[PDB]
């Protein structure tokens, strides 16, 4: 059904009324979201069906209808924008300068923005509106605040 490019809310009717479980990005006819939102399950768009194509639990990423299409990355210097789509609230752009997640397998950018669990999947954008990653997989630091990684997939 509806396949128009843009940011989408991932909902369900399994619990009390409608409940927002996460967010995703539609791009080039491919729905990109985080694995923990759908756990790999199929989706409904209008009267259509979005069946999974690629997914990975370590990366926490899943693409529907086709392979992962988002391939831009943070330059390590510029400020970025979390286009955060919160549950029950309207989409809202928040600008910030990401920090770093120092790992044994390389550095990754990280946004220090706290949002309710259903915001998971919301894109992180560069100065051209290019998707450089998704928000929703991170850690809780010493003072209690939440720092989410800029999770990006690989284009094939």
């Amino acid at each position: 059904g509806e396949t128009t490019d843009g940011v989408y809310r991932v909902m369900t009717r399994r619990l009390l009324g409608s409940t927002q479980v996460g967010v995703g990005v539609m791009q080039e006819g491919v729905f990109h979201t985080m694995w923990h939102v759908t756990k790999g399950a199929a989706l409904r768009s209008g009267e259509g069906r979005l069946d999974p194509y690629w997914g990975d639990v370590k990366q926490d990423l899943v693409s529907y209808c086709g392979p992962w299409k988002l391939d831009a990355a943070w330059d390590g210097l510029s400020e970025v924008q979390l286009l955060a789509v919160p549950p029950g609230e309207r989409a809202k752009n928040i600008q910030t300068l990401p920090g770093i997640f120092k790992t044994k397998d390389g550095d990754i950018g990280a946004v220090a923005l706290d949002y309710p669990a259903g915001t998971s999947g919301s894109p992180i954008l560069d100065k051209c509106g290019r998707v450089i990653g998704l928000y929703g997989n991170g850690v809780v630091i010493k003072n209690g605040s939440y720092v989410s990684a800029i999770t990006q997939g690989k284009r094939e």
Partner: protein
């Protein structure tokens, strides 16, 4: 079943709310996709 609903365009918007610090955290990533803090 789960379903999707449009929420907006993917565009950079000038004069947006600027907040959030930039920390350097030593972290680990487990086989289950969980991020741990290393200390």
């Amino acid at each position: 079943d789960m379903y999707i609903e449009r929420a907006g365009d993917i565009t950079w918007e000038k004069d947006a709310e600027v907040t959030g610090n930039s920390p350097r955290l030593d972290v680990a990533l487990d086989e289950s996709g969980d991020f741990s803090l290393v200390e």
